[PDB]
Amino acid sequence: AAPFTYWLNPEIYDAGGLSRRAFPEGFVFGTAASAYQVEGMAKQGGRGPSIWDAFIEKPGTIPNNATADVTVDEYHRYKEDVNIMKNMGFDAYRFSISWSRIFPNGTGMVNQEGVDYYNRLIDYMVKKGIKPYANLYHYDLPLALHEQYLGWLSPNIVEAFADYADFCFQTFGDRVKDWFTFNEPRCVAALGYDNGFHAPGRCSGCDAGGNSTTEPYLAAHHLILSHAAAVKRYREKYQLYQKGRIGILLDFVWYEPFSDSNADRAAAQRARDFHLGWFLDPIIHGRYPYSMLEIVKDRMPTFSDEESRMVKDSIDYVGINHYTSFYMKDPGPWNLTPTSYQDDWHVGFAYERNGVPIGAQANSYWLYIVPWGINKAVTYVKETYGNPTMILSENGMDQPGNVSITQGVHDTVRIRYYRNYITELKKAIDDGAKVIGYFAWSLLDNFEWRLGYTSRFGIVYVDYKTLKRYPKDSAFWFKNMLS
């Protein structure tokens, strides 16, 4: 790396008033990653294929036909990675367990080599004083279960997931005291089954097949049932002895009414219903959002009374993944013929008001930098869902992939992102929000799904040539803020 790499950025030492003492006693700071995005060894160590392994095969899917077969190779480099987390002052690490690394077929035969990996990773975190937060699912359905019955589209997936989860509880639950069933089930359902942007690539008229009017709702329904079934195992068999907690990780874009008109306000609420309420209303109230029931009608599955009881209160806390905000407008008169889940929202998007952008854009096409949105989103959950216990489980932003080491490490925009967002989060907590943790996405630059390696989200730069880690200025900003 060129000598400018080592210039000391003064922004590192501007914590903007933030410190641990500005947050609740015992408040957890961590970083979050996922198995597929960081591990490597996708086709090795006994790991069975997942839907993304098949999805990536088709040329054009990932920029420069890159894969996650190696990625940043945390499978071998976990000690270094945990050492960085500890040196930067983090309390915790939210990682995920690859279903197909534990069960290559999804069911039956345990891959012991996979189990051994997670045991190593967890034992080392513990040794180093890093709290393990284990997520069970991050986009990585075993391909065999998709081949057998179309995965999330079948009620068969429910007990299969619960069995896998049950296994993880008895195997890792002596050390792991903080569990999540799913990361972003809304994205699993919408990206996988509405427009086919993510594995398994299904939608109306997609090459893989599908039906954007029904499959998103079917997948989501089974995700909710699978979550509840997994939580039932934990609560009935493990929780009392292990003394841990279990939740779910939900993405939440803040939708701000474009104007104060009734129509624009109702549009913003509708977007929240279809985005967050889709999963949170069942978990907190045992039923789907009212607007969804009224718009989607017969295309939405119904819970039985038993199912409804199992789903309701099936969390000890909720994870809110939050990055961005948009303005939301009434789109005028609605189209009558169902086409897709996205179209079912019946909303208009806006990205500027009075010629002023809602915020600057990050590298990712969807990511607008709008710090006040984290405050609105957290406050909304507090006021709507009975002030639940919350973890702000993902927050971060990206640089373009094509940045060099020398410029990549000087990420002042990311420092300002964290300082501003965390400051707005602190405001929500000061006003009564029961937030107990905060997790930055992500420690390392990694495989960013359809963007491959063209998007860099890390507070630590990774040279993909050599797999060497270079802490960015933002990492040192955290180190100073947290000390």
Side-chain angles (χ1 to χ4, degrees), residues 347-392:
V347 298
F349 287 79
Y351 307 89
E352 53 165 280
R353 190 158 65 183
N354 308 130
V356 184
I358 195 167
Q361 204 197 286
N363 172 75
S364 285
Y365 63 89
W366 55 268
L367 211 173
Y368 286 78
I369 302 176
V370 190
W372 55 257
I374 202 162
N375 190 292
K376 301 266 189 156
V378 168
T379 304
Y380 175 82
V381 179
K382 166 175 129 265
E383 289 173 356
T384 311
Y385 298 103
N387 202 6
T389 303
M390 288 175 267
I391 302 174
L392 207 305

mmCIF file of all heavy atoms in Angstrom, residues 347-392:
data_model
loop_
_atom_site.group_PDB
_atom_site.id
_atom_site.type_symbol
_atom_site.label_atom_id
_atom_site.label_comp_id
_atom_site.label_asym_id
_atom_site.label_seq_id
_atom_site.Cartn_x
_atom_site.Cartn_y
_atom_site.Cartn_z
ATOM 1 N N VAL A 347 -48.006 2.225 -3.604
ATOM 2 C CA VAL A 347 -47.351 3.457 -3.144
ATOM 3 C C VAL A 347 -46.521 4.077 -4.262
ATOM 4 O O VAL A 347 -46.155 3.400 -5.217
ATOM 5 C CB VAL A 347 -46.450 3.228 -1.889
ATOM 6 C CG1 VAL A 347 -47.265 2.752 -0.730
ATOM 7 C CG2 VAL A 347 -45.299 2.248 -2.186
ATOM 8 N N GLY A 348 -46.236 5.367 -4.145
ATOM 9 C CA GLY A 348 -45.242 6.009 -5.003
ATOM 10 C C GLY A 348 -44.014 6.353 -4.176
ATOM 11 O O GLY A 348 -44.135 6.734 -3.015
ATOM 12 N N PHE A 349 -42.832 6.191 -4.768
ATOM 13 C CA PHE A 349 -41.567 6.554 -4.125
ATOM 14 C C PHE A 349 -41.152 7.970 -4.528
ATOM 15 O O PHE A 349 -41.502 8.439 -5.608
ATOM 16 C CB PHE A 349 -40.459 5.560 -4.522
ATOM 17 C CG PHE A 349 -40.580 4.204 -3.869
ATOM 18 C CD1 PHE A 349 -41.489 3.259 -4.345
ATOM 19 C CD2 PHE A 349 -39.767 3.865 -2.784
ATOM 20 C CE1 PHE A 349 -41.598 2.000 -3.743
ATOM 21 C CE2 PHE A 349 -39.870 2.602 -2.163
ATOM 22 C CZ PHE A 349 -40.786 1.675 -2.647
ATOM 23 N N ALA A 350 -40.420 8.647 -3.650
ATOM 24 C CA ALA A 350 -39.779 9.914 -3.970
ATOM 25 C C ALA A 350 -38.453 10.000 -3.221
ATOM 26 O O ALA A 350 -38.323 9.459 -2.121
ATOM 27 C CB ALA A 350 -40.681 11.096 -3.610
ATOM 28 N N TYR A 351 -37.484 10.691 -3.820
ATOM 29 C CA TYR A 351 -36.098 10.687 -3.357
ATOM 30 C C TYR A 351 -35.603 12.092 -3.085
ATOM 31 O O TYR A 351 -34.465 12.294 -2.660
ATOM 32 C CB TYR A 351 -35.196 9.998 -4.390
ATOM 33 C CG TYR A 351 -35.703 8.631 -4.769
ATOM 34 C CD1 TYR A 351 -36.609 8.470 -5.822
ATOM 35 C CD2 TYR A 351 -35.320 7.505 -4.052
ATOM 36 C CE1 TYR A 351 -37.101 7.224 -6.160
ATOM 37 C CE2 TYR A 351 -35.820 6.243 -4.385
ATOM 38 C CZ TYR A 351 -36.707 6.117 -5.437
ATOM 39 O OH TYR A 351 -37.196 4.882 -5.771
ATOM 40 N N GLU A 352 -36.475 13.057 -3.341
ATOM 41 C CA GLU A 352 -36.193 14.463 -3.119
ATOM 42 C C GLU A 352 -37.480 15.216 -2.837
ATOM 43 O O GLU A 352 -38.567 14.812 -3.261
ATOM 44 C CB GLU A 352 -35.473 15.079 -4.327
ATOM 45 C CG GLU A 352 -36.168 14.867 -5.667
ATOM 46 C CD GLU A 352 -35.630 15.791 -6.747
ATOM 47 O OE1 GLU A 352 -36.035 16.977 -6.780
ATOM 48 O OE2 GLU A 352 -34.796 15.333 -7.555
ATOM 49 N N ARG A 353 -37.345 16.314 -2.113
ATOM 50 C CA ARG A 353 -38.472 17.176 -1.805
ATOM 51 C C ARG A 353 -38.001 18.617 -1.912
ATOM 52 O O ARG A 353 -36.926 18.961 -1.396
ATOM 53 C CB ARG A 353 -39.000 16.876 -0.404
ATOM 54 C CG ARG A 353 -40.305 17.550 -0.066
ATOM 55 C CD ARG A 353 -40.993 16.804 1.050
ATOM 56 N NE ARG A 353 -40.252 16.862 2.308
ATOM 57 C CZ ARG A 353 -40.623 16.237 3.423
ATOM 58 N NH1 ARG A 353 -41.726 15.496 3.441
ATOM 59 N NH2 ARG A 353 -39.890 16.354 4.522
ATOM 60 N N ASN A 354 -38.801 19.448 -2.589
ATOM 61 C CA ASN A 354 -38.451 20.854 -2.834
ATOM 62 C C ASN A 354 -37.044 20.984 -3.443
ATOM 63 O O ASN A 354 -36.234 21.815 -3.009
ATOM 64 C CB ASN A 354 -38.576 21.680 -1.540
ATOM 65 C CG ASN A 354 -39.932 21.503 -0.852
ATOM 66 O OD1 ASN A 354 -39.999 21.241 0.359
ATOM 67 N ND2 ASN A 354 -41.019 21.645 -1.622
ATOM 68 N N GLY A 355 -36.767 20.130 -4.430
ATOM 69 C CA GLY A 355 -35.472 20.079 -5.108
ATOM 70 C C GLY A 355 -34.286 19.648 -4.255
ATOM 71 O O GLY A 355 -33.138 19.768 -4.689
ATOM 72 N N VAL A 356 -34.554 19.153 -3.048
ATOM 73 C CA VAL A 356 -33.496 18.698 -2.135
ATOM 74 C C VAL A 356 -33.586 17.184 -1.995
ATOM 75 O O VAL A 356 -34.632 16.673 -1.590
ATOM 76 C CB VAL A 356 -33.632 19.325 -0.726
ATOM 77 C CG1 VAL A 356 -32.455 18.918 0.173
ATOM 78 C CG2 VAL A 356 -33.751 20.851 -0.810
ATOM 79 N N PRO A 357 -32.491 16.462 -2.324
ATOM 80 C CA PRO A 357 -32.453 15.010 -2.123
ATOM 81 C C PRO A 357 -32.685 14.667 -0.658
ATOM 82 O O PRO A 357 -32.227 15.401 0.231
ATOM 83 C CB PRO A 357 -31.025 14.628 -2.529
ATOM 84 C CG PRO A 357 -30.586 15.734 -3.450
ATOM 85 C CD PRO A 357 -31.231 16.973 -2.896
ATOM 86 N N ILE A 358 -33.406 13.575 -0.409
ATOM 87 C CA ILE A 358 -33.602 13.091 0.956
ATOM 88 C C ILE A 358 -32.245 12.903 1.670
ATOM 89 O O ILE A 358 -32.111 13.158 2.879
ATOM 90 C CB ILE A 358 -34.506 11.821 1.005
ATOM 91 C CG1 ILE A 358 -34.989 11.565 2.443
ATOM 92 C CG2 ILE A 358 -33.819 10.598 0.354
ATOM 93 C CD1 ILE A 358 -36.117 10.543 2.563
ATOM 94 N N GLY A 359 -31.246 12.483 0.900
ATOM 95 C CA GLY A 359 -29.869 12.437 1.367
ATOM 96 C C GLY A 359 -28.946 12.044 0.236
ATOM 97 O O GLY A 359 -29.405 11.667 -0.850
ATOM 98 N N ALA A 360 -27.644 12.144 0.485
ATOM 99 C CA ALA A 360 -26.634 11.622 -0.431
ATOM 100 C C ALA A 360 -26.816 10.112 -0.648
ATOM 101 O O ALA A 360 -27.353 9.406 0.216
ATOM 102 C CB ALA A 360 -25.242 11.914 0.120
ATOM 103 N N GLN A 361 -26.366 9.616 -1.794
ATOM 104 C CA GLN A 361 -26.417 8.179 -2.058
ATOM 105 C C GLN A 361 -25.081 7.492 -1.748
ATOM 106 O O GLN A 361 -24.022 8.063 -1.965
ATOM 107 C CB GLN A 361 -26.856 7.918 -3.497
ATOM 108 C CG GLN A 361 -27.473 6.556 -3.703
ATOM 109 C CD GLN A 361 -27.513 6.167 -5.164
ATOM 110 O OE1 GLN A 361 -28.327 6.694 -5.934
ATOM 111 N NE2 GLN A 361 -26.617 5.251 -5.566
ATOM 112 N N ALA A 362 -25.139 6.285 -1.194
ATOM 113 C CA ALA A 362 -23.935 5.477 -1.023
ATOM 114 C C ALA A 362 -23.651 4.765 -2.351
ATOM 115 O O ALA A 362 -24.277 5.063 -3.352
ATOM 116 C CB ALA A 362 -24.118 4.473 0.112
ATOM 117 N N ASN A 363 -22.717 3.827 -2.369
ATOM 118 C CA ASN A 363 -22.477 3.044 -3.579
ATOM 119 C C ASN A 363 -23.737 2.291 -4.062
ATOM 120 O O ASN A 363 -24.089 2.385 -5.241
ATOM 121 C CB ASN A 363 -21.310 2.083 -3.382
ATOM 122 C CG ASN A 363 -21.144 1.108 -4.550
ATOM 123 O OD1 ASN A 363 -20.673 1.486 -5.612
ATOM 124 N ND2 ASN A 363 -21.520 -0.149 -4.342
ATOM 125 N N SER A 364 -24.412 1.581 -3.147
ATOM 126 C CA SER A 364 -25.593 0.769 -3.481
ATOM 127 C C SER A 364 -26.751 1.627 -3.959
ATOM 128 O O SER A 364 -27.060 2.650 -3.349
ATOM 129 C CB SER A 364 -26.038 -0.083 -2.289
ATOM 130 O OG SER A 364 -25.186 -1.205 -2.079
ATOM 131 N N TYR A 365 -27.388 1.195 -5.046
ATOM 132 C CA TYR A 365 -28.483 1.925 -5.700
ATOM 133 C C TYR A 365 -29.656 2.249 -4.751
ATOM 134 O O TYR A 365 -30.348 3.242 -4.940
ATOM 135 C CB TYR A 365 -29.002 1.121 -6.911
ATOM 136 C CG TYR A 365 -29.610 -0.217 -6.522
ATOM 137 C CD1 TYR A 365 -30.966 -0.326 -6.209
ATOM 138 C CD2 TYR A 365 -28.815 -1.373 -6.434
ATOM 139 C CE1 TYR A 365 -31.526 -1.555 -5.828
ATOM 140 C CE2 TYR A 365 -29.367 -2.604 -6.054
ATOM 141 C CZ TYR A 365 -30.722 -2.680 -5.764
ATOM 142 O OH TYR A 365 -31.270 -3.885 -5.385
ATOM 143 N N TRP A 366 -29.858 1.416 -3.730
ATOM 144 C CA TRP A 366 -30.981 1.554 -2.803
ATOM 145 C C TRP A 366 -30.652 2.372 -1.540
ATOM 146 O O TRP A 366 -31.556 2.728 -0.784
ATOM 147 C CB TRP A 366 -31.486 0.163 -2.391
ATOM 148 C CG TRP A 366 -30.404 -0.692 -1.821
ATOM 149 C CD1 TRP A 366 -29.613 -1.570 -2.500
ATOM 150 C CD2 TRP A 366 -29.956 -0.720 -0.453
ATOM 151 N NE1 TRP A 366 -28.710 -2.152 -1.639
ATOM 152 C CE2 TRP A 366 -28.890 -1.637 -0.383
ATOM 153 C CE3 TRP A 366 -30.355 -0.055 0.714
ATOM 154 C CZ2 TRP A 366 -28.222 -1.926 0.818
ATOM 155 C CZ3 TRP A 366 -29.686 -0.326 1.898
ATOM 156 C CH2 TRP A 366 -28.632 -1.255 1.943
ATOM 157 N N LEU A 367 -29.376 2.672 -1.314
ATOM 158 C CA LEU A 367 -28.945 3.235 -0.024
ATOM 159 C C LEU A 367 -28.744 4.742 -0.014
ATOM 160 O O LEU A 367 -27.713 5.244 -0.481
ATOM 161 C CB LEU A 367 -27.677 2.535 0.479
ATOM 162 C CG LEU A 367 -27.448 2.409 1.994
ATOM 163 C CD1 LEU A 367 -26.215 1.539 2.262
ATOM 164 C CD2 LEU A 367 -27.329 3.763 2.713
ATOM 165 N N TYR A 368 -29.735 5.443 0.547
ATOM 166 C CA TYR A 368 -29.677 6.878 0.796
ATOM 167 C C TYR A 368 -29.279 7.153 2.239
ATOM 168 O O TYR A 368 -29.725 6.466 3.152
ATOM 169 C CB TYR A 368 -31.020 7.534 0.469
ATOM 170 C CG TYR A 368 -31.246 7.638 -1.013
ATOM 171 C CD1 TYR A 368 -31.646 6.517 -1.758
ATOM 172 C CD2 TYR A 368 -31.009 8.835 -1.689
ATOM 173 C CE1 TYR A 368 -31.828 6.595 -3.131
ATOM 174 C CE2 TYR A 368 -31.196 8.927 -3.068
ATOM 175 C CZ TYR A 368 -31.609 7.808 -3.780
ATOM 176 O OH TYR A 368 -31.787 7.894 -5.147
ATOM 177 N N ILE A 369 -28.424 8.155 2.428
ATOM 178 C CA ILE A 369 -27.844 8.456 3.739
ATOM 179 C C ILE A 369 -28.755 9.473 4.431
ATOM 180 O O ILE A 369 -28.758 10.664 4.095
ATOM 181 C CB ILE A 369 -26.396 8.971 3.605
ATOM 182 C CG1 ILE A 369 -25.542 7.919 2.872
ATOM 183 C CG2 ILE A 369 -25.809 9.385 4.979
ATOM 184 C CD1 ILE A 369 -24.097 8.345 2.599
ATOM 185 N N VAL A 370 -29.568 8.967 5.360
ATOM 186 C CA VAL A 370 -30.637 9.749 5.970
ATOM 187 C C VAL A 370 -30.656 9.433 7.471
ATOM 188 O O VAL A 370 -31.471 8.628 7.925
ATOM 189 C CB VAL A 370 -32.028 9.427 5.337
ATOM 190 C CG1 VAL A 370 -33.045 10.419 5.813
ATOM 191 C CG2 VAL A 370 -31.975 9.402 3.791
ATOM 192 N N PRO A 371 -29.734 10.042 8.240
ATOM 193 C CA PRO A 371 -29.592 9.668 9.651
ATOM 194 C C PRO A 371 -30.860 9.770 10.512
ATOM 195 O O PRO A 371 -31.054 8.921 11.395
ATOM 196 C CB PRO A 371 -28.468 10.588 10.146
ATOM 197 C CG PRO A 371 -27.657 10.858 8.883
ATOM 198 C CD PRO A 371 -28.729 11.049 7.847
ATOM 199 N N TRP A 372 -31.719 10.762 10.249
ATOM 200 C CA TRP A 372 -32.939 10.958 11.045
ATOM 201 C C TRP A 372 -33.921 9.788 10.918
ATOM 202 O O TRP A 372 -34.736 9.551 11.817
ATOM 203 C CB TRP A 372 -33.631 12.313 10.743
ATOM 204 C CG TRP A 372 -33.998 12.605 9.283
ATOM 205 C CD1 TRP A 372 -33.328 13.434 8.422
ATOM 206 C CD2 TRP A 372 -35.130 12.098 8.543
ATOM 207 N NE1 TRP A 372 -33.961 13.465 7.195
ATOM 208 C CE2 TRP A 372 -35.066 12.654 7.242
ATOM 209 C CE3 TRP A 372 -36.185 11.228 8.851
ATOM 210 C CZ2 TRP A 372 -36.017 12.369 6.250
ATOM 211 C CZ3 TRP A 372 -37.124 10.941 7.866
ATOM 212 C CH2 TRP A 372 -37.030 11.509 6.577
ATOM 213 N N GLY A 373 -33.816 9.052 9.811
ATOM 214 C CA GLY A 373 -34.650 7.888 9.559
ATOM 215 C C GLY A 373 -34.499 6.776 10.581
ATOM 216 O O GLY A 373 -35.466 6.072 10.866
ATOM 217 N N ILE A 374 -33.299 6.604 11.137
ATOM 218 C CA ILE A 374 -33.108 5.585 12.176
ATOM 219 C C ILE A 374 -33.881 5.920 13.451
ATOM 220 O O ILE A 374 -34.419 5.034 14.106
ATOM 221 C CB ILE A 374 -31.601 5.268 12.472
ATOM 222 C CG1 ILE A 374 -31.454 3.876 13.119
ATOM 223 C CG2 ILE A 374 -30.928 6.365 13.318
ATOM 224 C CD1 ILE A 374 -30.010 3.283 13.038
ATOM 225 N N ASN A 375 -33.933 7.208 13.787
ATOM 226 C CA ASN A 375 -34.743 7.684 14.907
ATOM 227 C C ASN A 375 -36.250 7.457 14.677
ATOM 228 O O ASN A 375 -36.937 6.929 15.542
ATOM 229 C CB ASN A 375 -34.425 9.152 15.186
ATOM 230 C CG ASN A 375 -35.031 9.653 16.486
ATOM 231 O OD1 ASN A 375 -36.241 9.777 16.611
ATOM 232 N ND2 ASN A 375 -34.183 9.965 17.449
ATOM 233 N N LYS A 376 -36.756 7.841 13.511
ATOM 234 C CA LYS A 376 -38.161 7.609 13.172
ATOM 235 C C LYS A 376 -38.516 6.123 13.219
ATOM 236 O O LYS A 376 -39.559 5.758 13.748
ATOM 237 C CB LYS A 376 -38.494 8.156 11.777
ATOM 238 C CG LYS A 376 -38.255 9.646 11.594
ATOM 239 C CD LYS A 376 -39.489 10.479 11.836
ATOM 240 C CE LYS A 376 -39.217 11.921 11.405
ATOM 241 N NZ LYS A 376 -40.462 12.687 11.068
ATOM 242 N N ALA A 377 -37.651 5.280 12.654
ATOM 243 C CA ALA A 377 -37.903 3.839 12.563
ATOM 244 C C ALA A 377 -37.947 3.174 13.944
ATOM 245 O O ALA A 377 -38.874 2.421 14.253
ATOM 246 C CB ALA A 377 -36.856 3.151 11.636
ATOM 247 N N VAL A 378 -36.956 3.477 14.777
ATOM 248 C CA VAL A 378 -36.896 2.920 16.136
ATOM 249 C C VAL A 378 -38.077 3.396 16.990
ATOM 250 O O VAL A 378 -38.668 2.606 17.729
ATOM 251 C CB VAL A 378 -35.538 3.241 16.835
ATOM 252 C CG1 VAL A 378 -35.598 2.934 18.318
ATOM 253 C CG2 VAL A 378 -34.407 2.448 16.188
ATOM 254 N N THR A 379 -38.412 4.681 16.878
ATOM 255 C CA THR A 379 -39.535 5.272 17.619
ATOM 256 C C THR A 379 -40.852 4.617 17.179
ATOM 257 O O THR A 379 -41.707 4.303 18.020
ATOM 258 C CB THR A 379 -39.589 6.812 17.399
ATOM 259 O OG1 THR A 379 -38.334 7.386 17.782
ATOM 260 C CG2 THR A 379 -40.707 7.465 18.198
ATOM 261 N N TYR A 380 -40.994 4.406 15.867
ATOM 262 C CA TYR A 380 -42.162 3.744 15.315
ATOM 263 C C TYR A 380 -42.367 2.342 15.898
ATOM 264 O O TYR A 380 -43.485 1.990 16.265
ATOM 265 C CB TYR A 380 -42.099 3.693 13.786
ATOM 266 C CG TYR A 380 -43.236 2.917 13.156
ATOM 267 C CD1 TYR A 380 -44.494 3.508 12.946
ATOM 268 C CD2 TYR A 380 -43.065 1.585 12.777
ATOM 269 C CE1 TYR A 380 -45.547 2.775 12.368
ATOM 270 C CE2 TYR A 380 -44.105 0.854 12.193
ATOM 271 C CZ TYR A 380 -45.336 1.451 11.988
ATOM 272 O OH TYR A 380 -46.347 0.702 11.413
ATOM 273 N N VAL A 381 -41.302 1.547 15.988
ATOM 274 C CA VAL A 381 -41.404 0.210 16.584
ATOM 275 C C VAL A 381 -41.811 0.286 18.064
ATOM 276 O O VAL A 381 -42.646 -0.490 18.528
ATOM 277 C CB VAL A 381 -40.097 -0.625 16.419
ATOM 278 C CG1 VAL A 381 -40.244 -2.006 17.094
ATOM 279 C CG2 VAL A 381 -39.747 -0.801 14.942
ATOM 280 N N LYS A 382 -41.211 1.221 18.793
ATOM 281 C CA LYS A 382 -41.546 1.441 20.199
ATOM 282 C C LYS A 382 -43.035 1.762 20.377
ATOM 283 O O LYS A 382 -43.706 1.144 21.184
ATOM 284 C CB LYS A 382 -40.670 2.551 20.780
ATOM 285 C CG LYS A 382 -41.141 3.100 22.120
ATOM 286 C CD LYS A 382 -40.152 4.095 22.665
ATOM 287 C CE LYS A 382 -40.840 5.392 23.052
ATOM 288 N NZ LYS A 382 -40.821 6.449 22.002
ATOM 289 N N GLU A 383 -43.540 2.700 19.579
ATOM 290 C CA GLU A 383 -44.921 3.170 19.686
ATOM 291 C C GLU A 383 -45.966 2.210 19.122
ATOM 292 O O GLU A 383 -47.129 2.248 19.541
ATOM 293 C CB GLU A 383 -45.069 4.549 19.031
ATOM 294 C CG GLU A 383 -44.394 5.664 19.806
ATOM 295 C CD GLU A 383 -44.408 6.994 19.077
ATOM 296 O OE1 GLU A 383 -44.871 7.068 17.919
ATOM 297 O OE2 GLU A 383 -43.942 7.980 19.670
ATOM 298 N N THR A 384 -45.561 1.346 18.193
ATOM 299 C CA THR A 384 -46.506 0.467 17.501
ATOM 300 C C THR A 384 -46.575 -0.944 18.087
ATOM 301 O O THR A 384 -47.626 -1.578 18.054
ATOM 302 C CB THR A 384 -46.186 0.365 15.990
ATOM 303 O OG1 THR A 384 -46.011 1.676 15.459
ATOM 304 C CG2 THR A 384 -47.308 -0.335 15.230
ATOM 305 N N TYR A 385 -45.459 -1.434 18.615
ATOM 306 C CA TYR A 385 -45.368 -2.837 18.992
ATOM 307 C C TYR A 385 -45.106 -3.024 20.480
ATOM 308 O O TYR A 385 -44.448 -3.975 20.886
ATOM 309 C CB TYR A 385 -44.324 -3.566 18.118
ATOM 310 C CG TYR A 385 -44.689 -3.562 16.649
ATOM 311 C CD1 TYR A 385 -44.060 -2.692 15.754
ATOM 312 C CD2 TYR A 385 -45.688 -4.408 16.159
ATOM 313 C CE1 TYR A 385 -44.405 -2.681 14.398
ATOM 314 C CE2 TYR A 385 -46.042 -4.404 14.809
ATOM 315 C CZ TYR A 385 -45.391 -3.546 13.936
ATOM 316 O OH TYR A 385 -45.751 -3.532 12.604
ATOM 317 N N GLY A 386 -45.630 -2.098 21.280
ATOM 318 C CA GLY A 386 -45.654 -2.234 22.731
ATOM 319 C C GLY A 386 -44.323 -2.046 23.425
ATOM 320 O O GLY A 386 -44.048 -2.727 24.411
ATOM 321 N N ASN A 387 -43.524 -1.099 22.938
ATOM 322 C CA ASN A 387 -42.119 -0.941 23.342
ATOM 323 C C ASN A 387 -41.391 -2.276 23.546
ATOM 324 O O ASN A 387 -41.033 -2.628 24.674
ATOM 325 C CB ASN A 387 -41.959 -0.032 24.573
ATOM 326 C CG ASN A 387 -40.549 0.561 24.682
ATOM 327 O OD1 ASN A 387 -39.702 0.388 23.789
ATOM 328 N ND2 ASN A 387 -40.295 1.267 25.767
ATOM 329 N N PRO A 388 -41.164 -3.024 22.452
ATOM 330 C CA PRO A 388 -40.453 -4.294 22.581
ATOM 331 C C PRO A 388 -38.961 -4.069 22.840
ATOM 332 O O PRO A 388 -38.444 -2.976 22.592
ATOM 333 C CB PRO A 388 -40.654 -4.945 21.206
ATOM 334 C CG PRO A 388 -40.738 -3.774 20.263
ATOM 335 C CD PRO A 388 -41.501 -2.718 21.047
ATOM 336 N N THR A 389 -38.278 -5.098 23.338
ATOM 337 C CA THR A 389 -36.818 -5.067 23.418
ATOM 338 C C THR A 389 -36.260 -5.205 22.001
ATOM 339 O O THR A 389 -36.646 -6.102 21.245
ATOM 340 C CB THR A 389 -36.276 -6.152 24.376
ATOM 341 O OG1 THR A 389 -36.865 -5.955 25.664
ATOM 342 C CG2 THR A 389 -34.752 -6.074 24.515
ATOM 343 N N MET A 390 -35.377 -4.273 21.651
ATOM 344 C CA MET A 390 -34.840 -4.153 20.310
ATOM 345 C C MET A 390 -33.321 -4.229 20.289
ATOM 346 O O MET A 390 -32.637 -3.767 21.200
ATOM 347 C CB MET A 390 -35.259 -2.819 19.698
ATOM 348 C CG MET A 390 -36.719 -2.724 19.324
ATOM 349 S SD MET A 390 -37.121 -1.062 18.737
ATOM 350 C CE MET A 390 -37.665 -0.303 20.270
ATOM 351 N N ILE A 391 -32.809 -4.830 19.230
ATOM 352 C CA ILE A 391 -31.414 -4.697 18.869
ATOM 353 C C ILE A 391 -31.410 -4.002 17.511
ATOM 354 O O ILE A 391 -32.144 -4.413 16.597
ATOM 355 C CB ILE A 391 -30.718 -6.075 18.796
ATOM 356 C CG1 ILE A 391 -30.827 -6.797 20.148
ATOM 357 C CG2 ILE A 391 -29.246 -5.913 18.387
ATOM 358 C CD1 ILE A 391 -30.303 -8.225 20.161
ATOM 359 N N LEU A 392 -30.638 -2.919 17.396
ATOM 360 C CA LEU A 392 -30.338 -2.340 16.092
ATOM 361 C C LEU A 392 -29.243 -3.231 15.485
ATOM 362 O O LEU A 392 -28.060 -3.082 15.769
ATOM 363 C CB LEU A 392 -29.924 -0.856 16.190
ATOM 364 C CG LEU A 392 -30.172 0.061 14.973
ATOM 365 C CD1 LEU A 392 -29.530 -0.468 13.690
ATOM 366 C CD2 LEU A 392 -31.655 0.332 14.732
#
